[PDB]
Amino acid sequence: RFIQWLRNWASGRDLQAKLQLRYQEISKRTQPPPKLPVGPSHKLSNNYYCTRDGRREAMPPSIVMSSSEKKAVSPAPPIKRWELSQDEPY
């Protein structure tokens, strides 16, 4: 129709990516009942406490406090640089 192509001369022409999803091909509903898998060592005869010790980790280790040709070690190796992401860097 003639009101259609005036939208297609202005700002390109899209015709499919509407601002509403109110039309068809929006996902309406889903049928099936769910059931969840129970995976991570929930079972028996090996899955067993004192192996999984998720807590009880010790104190922060004290280093030499009050009461030699060292190489002047950095806290970490320095940050090596970056690439330039070869899609369109300009």
Locate 45 and state its tokens.
């005869």
Locate 16 and state its tokens.
């499919």
23 binds another protein (CB under 8 A): yes
SS3 46: coil
Q: Which is nearer to another protein, 45 or 84 (CB)?
A: 84
CB 8 within 8 A of CB 15: yes
From 11, 15, 44, 45, residue interacting with another protein (rule: CB under 8 A) = 11
**Under the rule (CB under 8 A), what is the footprint of another protein?**
3, 6-7, 9-11, 14, 17-27, 29-30, 32-42, 51-67, 70, 72-76, 78-79, 82-85, 87-90
